[PDB]
Amino acid sequence: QYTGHITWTPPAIFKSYCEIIVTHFPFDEQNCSMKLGTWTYDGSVVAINPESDQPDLSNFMESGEWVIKESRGWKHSVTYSCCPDTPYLDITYHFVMQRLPLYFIVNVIIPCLLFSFLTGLVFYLPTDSGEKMTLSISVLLSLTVFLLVIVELIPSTSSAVPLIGKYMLFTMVFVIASIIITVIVINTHHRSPSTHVMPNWVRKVFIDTIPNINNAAAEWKYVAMVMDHILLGVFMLVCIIGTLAVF
Amino acid sequence: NVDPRAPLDSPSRQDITFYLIIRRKPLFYIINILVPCVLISFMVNLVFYLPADSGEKTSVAISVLLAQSVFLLLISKRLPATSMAIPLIGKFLLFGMVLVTMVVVICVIVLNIHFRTPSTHVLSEGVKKLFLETLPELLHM
Amino acid sequence: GQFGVAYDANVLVYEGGSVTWLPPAIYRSVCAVEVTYFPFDWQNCSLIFRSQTYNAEEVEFTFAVDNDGKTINKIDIDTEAYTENGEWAIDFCPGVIRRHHGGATDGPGETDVIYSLIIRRKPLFYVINIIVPCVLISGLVLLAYFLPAQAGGQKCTVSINVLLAQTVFLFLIAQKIPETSLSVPLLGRFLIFVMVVATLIVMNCVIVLNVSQRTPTTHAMSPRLRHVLLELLPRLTGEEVSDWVRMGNALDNICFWAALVLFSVGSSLIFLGAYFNRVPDLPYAPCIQP
Amino acid sequence: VDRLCLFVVTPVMVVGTAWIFLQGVYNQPPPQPFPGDPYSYNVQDKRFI
Amino acid sequence: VVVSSDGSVRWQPPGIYRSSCSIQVTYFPFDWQNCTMVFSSYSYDSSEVSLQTGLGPDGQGHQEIHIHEGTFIENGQWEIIHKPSRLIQPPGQRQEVIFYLIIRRKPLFYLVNVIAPCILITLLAIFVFYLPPDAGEKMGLSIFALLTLTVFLLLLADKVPETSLSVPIIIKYLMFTMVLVTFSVILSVVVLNLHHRSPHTHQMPLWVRQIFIHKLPLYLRLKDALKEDWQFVAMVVDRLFLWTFIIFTSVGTLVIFLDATYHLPPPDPFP
Numbered sequence: 001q002y003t004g005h006i007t008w009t010p011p012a013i014f015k016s017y018c019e020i021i022v023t024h025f026p027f028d029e030q031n032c033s034m035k036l037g038t039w040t041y042d043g044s045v046v047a048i049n050p051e052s053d054q055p056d057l058s059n060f061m062e063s064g065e066w067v068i069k070e071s072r073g074w075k076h077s078v079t080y081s082c083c084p085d086t087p088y089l090d091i092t093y094h095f096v097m098q099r100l101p102l103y104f105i106v107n108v109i110i111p112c113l114l115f116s117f118l119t120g121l122v123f124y125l126p127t128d129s130g131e132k133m134t135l136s137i138s139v140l141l142s143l144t145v146f147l148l149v150i151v152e153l154i155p156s157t158s159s160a161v162p163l164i165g166k167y168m169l170f171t172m173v174f175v176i177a178s179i180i181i182t183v184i185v186i187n188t189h190h191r192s193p194s195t196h197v198m199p200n201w202v203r204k205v206f207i208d209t210i211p212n213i214n215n216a217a218a219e220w221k222y223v224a225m226v227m228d229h230i231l232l233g234v235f236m237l238v239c240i241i242g243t244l245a246v247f
Numbered sequence: 248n249v250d251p252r253a254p255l256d257s258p259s260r261q262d263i264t265f266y267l268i269i270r271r272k273p274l275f276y277i278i279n280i281l282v283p284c285v286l287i288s289f290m291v292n293l294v295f296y297l298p299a300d301s302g303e304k305t306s307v308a309i310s311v312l313l314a315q316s317v318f319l320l321l322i323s324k325r326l327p328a329t330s331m332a333i334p335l336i337g338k339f340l341l342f343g344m345v346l347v348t349m350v351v352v353i354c355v356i357v358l359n360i361h362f363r364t365p366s367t368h369v370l371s372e373g374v375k376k377l378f379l380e381t382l383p384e385l386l387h388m
Numbered sequence: 389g390q391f392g393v394a395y396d397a398n399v400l401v402y403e404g405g406s407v408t409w410l411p412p413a414i415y416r417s418v419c420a421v422e423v424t425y426f427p428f429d430w431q432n433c434s435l436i437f438r439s440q441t442y443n444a445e446e447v448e449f450t451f452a453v454d455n456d457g458k459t460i461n462k463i464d465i466d467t468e469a470y471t472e473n474g475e476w477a478i479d480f481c482p483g484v485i486r487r488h489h490g491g492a493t494d495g496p497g498e499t500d501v502i503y504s505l506i507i508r509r510k511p512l513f514y515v516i517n518i519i520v521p522c523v524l525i526s527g528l529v530l531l532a533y534f535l536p537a538q539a540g541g542q543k544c545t546v547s548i549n550v551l552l553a554q555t556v557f558l559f560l561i562a563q564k565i566p567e568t569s570l571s572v573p574l575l576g577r578f579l580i581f582v583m584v585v586a587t588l589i590v591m592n593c594v595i596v597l598n599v600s601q602r603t604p605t606t607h608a609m610s611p612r613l614r615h616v617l618l619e620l621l622p623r624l625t626g627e628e629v630s631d632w633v634r635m636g637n638a639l640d641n642i643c644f645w646a647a648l649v650l651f652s653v654g655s656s657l658i659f660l661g662a663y664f665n666r667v668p669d670l671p672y673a674p675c676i677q678p
Numbered sequence: 679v680d681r682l683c684l685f686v687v688t689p690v691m692v693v694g695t696a697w698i699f700l701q702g703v704y705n706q707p708p709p710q711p712f713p714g715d716p717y718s719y720n721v722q723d724k725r726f727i
Numbered sequence: 728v729v730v731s732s733d734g735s736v737r738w739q740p741p742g743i744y745r746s747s748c749s750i751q752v753t754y755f756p757f758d759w760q761n762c763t764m765v766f767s768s769y770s771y772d773s774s775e776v777s778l779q780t781g782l783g784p785d786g787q788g789h790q791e792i793h794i795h796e797g798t799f800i801e802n803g804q805w806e807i808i809h810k811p812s813r814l815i816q817p818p819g820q821r822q823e824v825i826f827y828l829i830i831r832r833k834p835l836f837y838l839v840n841v842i843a844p845c846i847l848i849t850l851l852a853i854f855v856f857y858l859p860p861d862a863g864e865k866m867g868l869s870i871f872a873l874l875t876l877t878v879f880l881l882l883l884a885d886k887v888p889e890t891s892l893s894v895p896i897i898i899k900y901l902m903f904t905m906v907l908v909t910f911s912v913i914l915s916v917v918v919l920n921l922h923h924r925s926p927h928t929h930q931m932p933l934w935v936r937q938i939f940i941h942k943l944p945l946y947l948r949l950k951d952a953l954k955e956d957w958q959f960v961a962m963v964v965d966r967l968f969l970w971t972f973i974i975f976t977s978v979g980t981l982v983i984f985l986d987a988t989y990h991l992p993p994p995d996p997f998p
């Protein structure tokens with residue numbers, strides 16, 4: 001302009017570093033910033049001032065994955081070790097993005113919820129089916145595949161474990177425990193009574209107390225069945241309790 | 248190439264086009280893809296020969312279906328998503344998967360029939376005359 | 389191929405003829421990775437700076453001198469600029485000004501500054517998300533022995549499915565780790581060892597199912613193996629079928645104990661090397677001051 | 679029923695597989711690069727002025 | 728550039744452009760996309776450079792993307808239906824000329840490679856309820872169907888955009904089907920638990936018999952002793968689930984598939 005006032009509005013693509021906080025992924029919010037300042041001119045030589053305390057979002061093409069909850073630009077005057085006599089000005093614009101979780105809930109969380117629910121269902125399946133391990137190991141494999149999936153979605157930074165990562169590890173431990181106990185129950189059902197006499201405490205619990213609250217082989221099967229009934233309730237409730245405690 | 252309808256002062260009126268009519272050397276794909284896919288597909292024919300007492304016929308059929316699905320995944324990665332035509336090996340894979348699905352249905356029906364009981368099913372005289380006298384003789388059983 | 393700096397910042401010409409240049413640069417540089425102790429590995433990456441044009445008799449490098457007069461013979465880190473990496477810690481970053489002879493005709497000397505970024509992996513992410521899953525999967529390998537040696541016993545099915553899961557984990561590791569063949573990661577060696585053990589579990593399950601399903605109408609019972617499994621190992625036509633079943637169960641038990649001991653020893657010895665793979669004690673000052 | 683379904687499906691599978699793959703194998707480029715143009719556009723067929 | 732003696736300058740530079748286009752995720756793979764190319768002078772204001780849509784050769788206001796149909800490289804996956812242009816007046820502001828490409832996805836590739844396999848796997852997941860418990864393959868088949876559908880979901884999740892403003896109708900179908908197969912596994916476990924019952928394990932109550940022997944077999948056309956009673960109940964319950972799962976799956980899938988097909992691109996580019 002004739003007054004000498006220059007307005008320059010160059011376009012740029014900024015691939016700025018941002019510390020992605022993975023703790024609450026996919027319900028997480030990310031504080032990402034852009035530290036801009038004159039490189040060679042110090043604050044006593046060229047002073048930069050923010051046009052407005054917030055970035056101009058009027059032309060912002062609204063993202064379909066992230067909502068900008070707030071944005072703000074703060075001017076700073078830090079002194080670097082290169083240049084101790086002269087502080088250098090910068091304006092750090094920042095954006096508090098929040099993820100829209102619908103895409104990740106559908107494609108990640110819901111299948112994992114289905115598999116975690118199926119983890120307890122094995123204790124309703126009788127041993128005579130010959131398929132309890134077929135169910136349990138297949139659930140284990142599916143959860144392993146989904147753990148593989150989540151590892152691709154998150155930074156490998158060791159700052160903190162994601163809540164979905166924690167949930168997946170918990171579910172994996174629960175699956176391993178369910179498999180171990182399923183194997184124990186199967187071995188109990190197939191337990192030969194001639195070589196393995198039933199101890200008094202196991203009978204007193206599982207035949208007398210728990211259900212009220214060839215025959216010897218059937219008694220071992222009855223114990224295993226009562227274990228199955230107890231374990232189903234525990235696994236189903238622990239699953240829902242764990243899901244609620246997580247969500 | 249000269250386009251007679253294009254204006255003399257247009258850029259599109261003239262061009263020189265060099266063409267490469269190239270044929271794929273298929274032996275690599277025959278060895279690595281087609282032969283394994285066909286062999287695994289034809290494995291589904293063993294489901295009928297496997298006894299119903301084995302309790303593995305559905306396992307075989309569904310495993311063949313899974314392998315065919317994996318092969319279809321591979322080829323769909325190697326080829327563009329053009330809707331102009333279905334690729335030949337893709338047509339083969341779809342046909343094979345349809346047949347394998349039909350074989351799973353047949354196997355389920357056969358297993359259901361195998362475990363039928365007079366307390367739960369009625370063996371009609373026509374069914375007996377068909378499947379015990381006539382057909383096994385026709386099939387040299 | 390990006391030899392030079394990313395931004396051609398202005399130089400500062402101070403009075404007295406001192407010229408200062410401090411351009412920002414992003415550098416991608418060759419760092420040979422020693423994957424042996426992954427995820428507990430540390431990497432000796434290095435940055436080699438030299439004049440592209442002038443030899444050591446035309447341009448000579450020296451380290452900057454701190455305000456206290458101490459030479460900064462290391463990568464400088466400014467608290468107002470440095471952002472910690474969440475995956476790699478930095479332990480040491482010494483600098484050395486190297487000097488060499490020129491061409492074989494005793495050519496003019498050459499000089500370069502090499503900074504040795506000794507960085508260390510923060511393993512916590514990989515322990516939780518890889519190591520613990522692989523160990524839990526390897527635990528299920530031993531459970532197949534407790535499964536019945538009779539129809540409906542999914543011993544082989546379980547063993548092969550767990551082997552497949554460990555193979556999937558091997559595929560995951562092969563993606564995250566370079567194709568370099570100078571060494572095998574100890575985690576990869578553990579995976580291979582567990583896969584071998586799982587194949588031996590499959591073999592043992594097949595043997596147990598063979599022995600258990602043997603019959604006097606088709607097999608003659610070996611007196612040595614029968615007497616062993618009946619008395620010597622525990623103390624260390626229906627009757628014949630029961631004897632076969634008991635021998636199968638004894639074989640299952642003894643192979644379970646053997647496999648458990650072997651697996652535990654192997655896994656401990658493999659992971660023990662990674663635990664001992666601390667960053668070595670070195671005379672250099674820490675790169676990031678406390 | 680098993681053997682009947684074998685005798686039905688196996689020849690159908692084989693015939694469909696053979697039909698598809700034979701229809702593939704017989705595919706060849708035309709003897710001339712442009713259909714309807716008799717010229718071969720080949721080094722040996724120099725079309726002297 | 729070509730400069731005429733009257734000072735008319737014509738410039739036809741080639742461009743390779745990668746514009747942002749908000750993807751209509753919903754009706755995949757029958758979806759149609761409305762992509763825009765926004766051309767404007769970067770610097771000069773509407774008071775300095777006035778943009779206009781190019782006229783037709785006869786001077787007609789032929790506000791369309793020009794396509795030389797004899798030489799245009801036809802895309803193998805997308806069909807161009809409407810291609811209008813509009814001059815946008817400013818709300819120091821700038822004018823914009825926006826070109827619109829209304830492209831319809833040609834769905835044959837995804838029908839064959841995705842939808843048909845999923846339908847086949849769903850059909851096999853249905854027949855799970857016809858497989859008798861004594862075969863010992865019911866958990867096998869149901870779980871393998873569920874896992875294969877989950878694999879297809881994970882694969883297709885990479886095909887669809889990661890944006891979460893809506894869920895693709897095919898993804899809704901896949902999720903509904905996966906829920907269906909999870910219920911199929913649950914009900915198969917229920918049927919197996921009923922089948923293996925015995926008077927040493929469970930004693931049949933009056934209501935269970937009254938329902939699953941009297942009422943349901945009459946509707947379903949169905950017809951050691953106590954073990955057989957549990958097994959007959961299990962078979963009737965298995966057949967009950969078969970028909971109900973047939974109804975739920977067939978109606979639900981058809982409604983979802985019809986909804987995808989109904990939403991054809993509009994006949995007018997500016998509805």
Ligand SMILES: *[C@@H]1O[C@H](CO)[C@@H](O[C@@H]2O[C@H](CO)[C@@H](O[C@@H]3O[C@H](CO[C@H]4O[C@H](CO)[C@@H](O)[C@H](O[C@H]5O[C@H](CO)[C@@H](O)[C@H](O)[C@@H]5O)[C@@H]4O)[C@@H](O)[C@H](O[C@H]4O[C@H](CO)[C@@H](O)[C@H](O)[C@@H]4O[C@@H]4O[C@H](CO)[C@@H](O)[C@H](O)[C@H]4NC(C)=O)[C@@H]3O)[C@H](O)[C@H]2NC(C)=O)[C@H](O)[C@H]1NC(C)=O
Nearest residue numbers: 248249250251264266268707708710711712713714715797
């Ligand atoms: C690999 O790919 C390349 C391209 O990437 C393929 O090359 C193409 O090959 C085809 C097959 O030959 C070519 O199509 C033919 O082109 C010629 C040349 O026509 C052009 O020049 C003429 C003047 O030189 C001009 O009149 C023509 O205009 C015509 O076409 C345009 C566009 O459609 C129309 O707008 C016009 O109104 C006009 O129709 C054009 O610029 C044509 O002669 C030839 O036309 C014959 O075939 C058509 C269908 O096959 C008929 O509709 C026509 O009526 C005409 O019929 C033919 O007439 C002959 C003369 O009497 C007669 O001998 C013949 O028997 C008869 N055929 C029939 C079937 O009736 C046709 O359009 C195409 O242009 C090439 N593209 C290029 C070079 O870029 C190549 O084939 C591929 N290789 C493979 C697959 O191996």
Ligand SMILES: *[C@@H]1O[C@H](CO)[C@@H](O[C@@H]2O[C@H](CO)[C@@H](O[C@@H]3O[C@H](CO[C@H]4O[C@H](CO[C@H]5O[C@H](CO)[C@@H](O)[C@H](O)[C@@H]5O)[C@@H](O)[C@H](O[C@H]5O[C@H](CO)[C@@H](O)[C@H](O)[C@@H]5O)[C@@H]4O)[C@@H](O)[C@H](O[C@H]4O[C@H](CO)[C@@H](O)[C@H](O)[C@@H]4O)[C@@H]3O)[C@H](O)[C@H]2NC(C)=O)[C@H](O)[C@H]1NC(C)=O
Nearest residue numbers: 031032033034070073074075076077078092093094095096
């Ligand atoms: C997301 O992440 C971003 C970062 O990525 C984060 O951004 C921070 O946001 C907080 C607020 O939420 C900011 O804090 C504000 O900072 C303002 C600017 O502070 C600078 O400038 C001050 C101006 O000083 C004057 O005088 C000095 C002489 O001292 C002179 O140099 C200057 O010319 C100037 O005229 C200065 O005082 C200030 O120094 C502060 O900080 C240093 C440490 O660096 C400390 O030693 C000092 O004592 C002092 O605290 C700094 O240089 C500031 O104005 C503002 O003040 C508010 O709070 C105070 C109370 O603390 C009130 O009195 C005042 O009225 C204001 O309300 C406040 O401190 C911070 O700077 C941002 N940082 C960055 C890097 O951007 C977001 O918050 C994150 N958000 C979420 C949701 O996660």
Ligand SMILES: *[C@@H]1O[C@H](CO)[C@@H](O[C@@H]2O[C@H](CO)[C@@H](O[C@@H]3O[C@H](CO[C@H]4O[C@H](CO)[C@@H](O)[C@H](O)[C@@H]4O)[C@@H](O)[C@H](O)[C@@H]3O)[C@H](O)[C@H]2NC(C)=O)[C@H](O)[C@H]1NC(C)=O
Nearest residue numbers: 431432433434483484485486487488502504505506668670
């Ligand atoms: C991290 O990486 C650095 C770069 O690889 C390592 O520094 C190098 O370590 C090697 C270890 O073998 C040293 O090589 C030895 O050097 C001594 C010293 O001789 C030097 O001087 C003579 C004469 O000029 C010259 O011929 C040598 O090459 C050396 O420059 C020799 O006596 C040995 O035979 C052998 O060559 C390198 O010298 C050393 N270089 C530098 C620049 O430090 C470092 O050790 C690695 N650190 C860790 C913790 O892994």
Ligand SMILES: *[C@@H]1O[C@H](CO)[C@@H](O[C@@H]2O[C@H](CO)[C@@H](O[C@@H]3O[C@H](CO[C@H]4O[C@H](CO)[C@@H](O)[C@H](O)[C@@H]4O)[C@@H](O)[C@H](O)[C@@H]3O)[C@H](O)[C@H]2NC(C)=O)[C@H](O)[C@H]1NC(C)=O
Nearest residue numbers: 761762763809813815818825827829992993995996997998
């Ligand atoms: C493809 O997407 C295009 C945008 O990306 C679609 O174009 C949109 O079409 C709709 C339907 O006509 C328009 O909405 C109308 O806009 C006019 C003009 O609005 C302006 O003027 C009024 C004053 O009359 C003012 O109030 C407004 O603020 C605007 O300045 C209105 O008169 C109508 O009531 C109605 O809102 C969109 O404006 C138009 N957008 C653009 C950018 O052109 C296109 O239709 C899409 N195609 C398909 C097939 O869906």
Ligand SMILES: *[C@@H]1O[C@H](CO)[C@@H](O[C@@H]2O[C@H](CO)[C@@H](O)[C@H](O)[C@H]2NC(C)=O)[C@H](O)[C@H]1NC(C)=O
Nearest residue numbers: 399400401402403404405406407408409448450
């Ligand atoms: C660089 O220039 C300065 C400024 O001229 C020199 O410092 C002295 O400056 C005074 C000006 O009052 C002259 O009279 C002296 O002759 C200059 N020299 C000395 C040695 O005092 C300075 O010498 C010049 N050179 C360097 C290397 O800094």
Ligand SMILES: CC(=O)OCC[N+](C)(C)C
Nearest residue numbers: 039040080083088397410
């Ligand atoms: C003088 C100069 O170029 O300084 C650059 C470094 N900075 C801007 C962080 C102080």
